[PDB]
Amino acid sequence: SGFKCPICSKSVASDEMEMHFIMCLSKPRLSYNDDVLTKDAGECVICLEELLQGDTIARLPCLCIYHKSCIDSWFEVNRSCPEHPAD
Amino acid sequence: GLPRRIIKETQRLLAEPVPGIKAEPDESNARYFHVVIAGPQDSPFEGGTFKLELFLPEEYPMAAPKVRFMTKIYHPNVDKLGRICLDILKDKWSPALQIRTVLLSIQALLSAPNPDDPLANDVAEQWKTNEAQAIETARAWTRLYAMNNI
Ligand SMILES: [Zn+2]
Ligand SMILES: [Zn+2]
Ligand SMILES: [Zn+2]
């Protein structure tokens, strides 16, 4: 354990905190676009429930999709795409 | 007298200031620091200069610094008295943290507000029910209170 960055949710040691926080303050953090799914798209890799037409989804810049609720929960612990953790 | 840790932190703040943060000891009581935090870029606080007062209690570093905003700010974790709801200032304090990392933590909180904190306030409600308008209000307050205030 360490100290959690509120911008990206990563925990860092106290002696890494200054340079980490400055970096996260230097550029916009990872974001997604809200959307309503237009057609079924298989299972969400977070919850394993189907991504069904009408679902309230998030589309990340890497083009991955998740339920909005699911990616929001993951972003509380690590603000990164589950499939593209290093972009 | 000031313990050596405070002397060291003070000298290192002077020699190596944190980018975007001004922090200088008060001339009369060296446990007080006058702080200016730049609003984070790409937040509704961008372009603002926010004054804060920081105080090192007698027990420091066994107790957290006491920090409050002196500039009006529209943020779900800052109340109308300028008090800051931030875990590292209370239950999650650790003596591994220092003035410089406390102030960076506050700046990072400006970039990533937490409207879900258990303490219920009107600003956090606005952030959850109408985030777009809350952000615009934060922008308006930044331009009214946090520009040309230094
Ligand atoms: Zn971060
Ligand atoms: Zn899901
Ligand atoms: Zn992805």
Residue numbers in the entry:
A (entry chain B): 141 to 227
B (entry chain A): 3 to 152
Task: Give sentences copied directly from the paper behind this entry.
E3 ligases catalyze the final step in this cascade by promoting the transfer of activated Ubs from E2∼Ub thioester intermediates to specific substrates or to the growing ends of substrate-linked Ub chains. One such study carried out by Hoxhaj et al. found that RING E3 ligase ZNRF1 co-purifies with Ube2N from transiently transfected HEK293 cells in stoichiometric amounts. This E3 ligase was first identified as one of the gene products up-regulated in Schwann cells upon peripheral nerve injury and contains a Zinc-finger (ZnF) domain juxtaposed to its C-terminal RING domain. Though the precise cellular roles of ZNRF1 remain to be deciphered, it has been found to co-localize with tubulin in cells and ubiquitinates protein kinase B (Akt1), glutamine synthase, and the α subunit of Na+/K+ pump. Our results reveal that despite having a canonical E3 : E2 interaction, mediated exclusively by the RING domain, ZNRF1/Ube2N interface is ‘tuned’ at the molecular level to achieve unprecedented nanomolar affinity.
